[PDB]
Amino acid sequence: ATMKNAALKQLTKDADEILHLIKVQLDNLCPLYEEVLDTQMFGLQKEVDFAVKLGLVDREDGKQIMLRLEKELSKLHEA
Template sequence: MLHLHQKALHLLQEDADKIEKLIEVQMENLATRKCPLYEEVLDTQMYGFSREVDFAVRAGLVPETAGKQLLSILERNLAQLYEALDQKK
C-alpha cells in the first residue's frame, strides 16, 4: 500500500508542477497586459487539481495533510500572482 501512496503523491506532484509552471509563466510576463483567459485557465486548473486531491484523499491514496499541503502551496503562489497583477493595474 505504501507504494500506491507514493505513486499517488508523485502523480499529484506532477500535476501541481504543471500548474506551478503556468503560474511562473504568468509571473514572468507581468510586464505584458493582464490576460483574463489565462486567469480562467489557471482557476480551472486549480479547481481540477483540488478535485484530484480530494479524490485521492477520500480514496485513501494520500494522507489528508499531504493533499492539503500541495493545495496550499499552489494557492499561495496563485494568490501572489493575483496580488502582483492587481498592483500592475
C-alpha cells in the same frame, strides 16, 4: 502503501505543471487568464480529493499540495 507513493508522485507532477503556468505569468511583466487557472486549480483539487478519499494520500499532504500553488497564485493578482 506502494500505491501511496505513486499517487503522491503523480499529484505533485500535476501540481508542478500548473505551478509552471503560474510562475511563467509572474516571471513576465491578462486579460482574464485567472479564469484558466481557476479551472486548472479545480481539476487538481478534484484529483487531490479523489486521492484523499481513497486513503492513497494523507489529508495534510493534499492540503500542502494545494497551499503551495494557492500561495503562488496570490502573488499573481495583484494586477
